[PDB]
């Protein structure tokens, strides 16, 4: 996987245009060991072809490493969603991707 950074800016009532997927904090995230093939707990299940994230170059399969400066490699699903939500209309993400 290769790292990239995307800065997403949206309007109040739209989304950023992706579905996030990964393990909830009730799984033993304390035991998660990143590997090259599975480098972070949360990844992109889909990216809306009409949306902000698509235009920033994000694609299905990208693994989420950082949200607004906070590393999320070993962070549970609902907690990562909360970190994204708290940024409002701007999201600075770092991901690792097959391309």
């Amino acid at each position: 996987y290769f790292q990239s950074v995307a800065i997403l800016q949206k309007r109040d009532h739209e989304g950023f245009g992706f579905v996030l997927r990964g393990a909830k904090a009730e799984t033993p995230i304390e035991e998660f060991t990143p590997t090259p093939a599975f480098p972070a707990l949360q990844y992109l299940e889909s990216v809306d072809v009409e949306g902000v994230a698509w235009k920033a170059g994000l694609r299905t399969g990208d693994f989420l490493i950082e949200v607004n400066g906070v590393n999320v490699v070993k962070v549970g699903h609902k907690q990562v969603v909360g970190l994204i939500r708290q940024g409002g209309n701007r999201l600075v993400m770092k991901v690792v991707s097959v391309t």
Binding site: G15, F16, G17, F18, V19, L20, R21, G22, A23, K24, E45, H77, K78, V81, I84
Partner: peptide, 6 residues
Amino acid sequence: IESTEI
């Protein structure tokens, strides 16, 4: 494993 639209 959970999924959420963002």
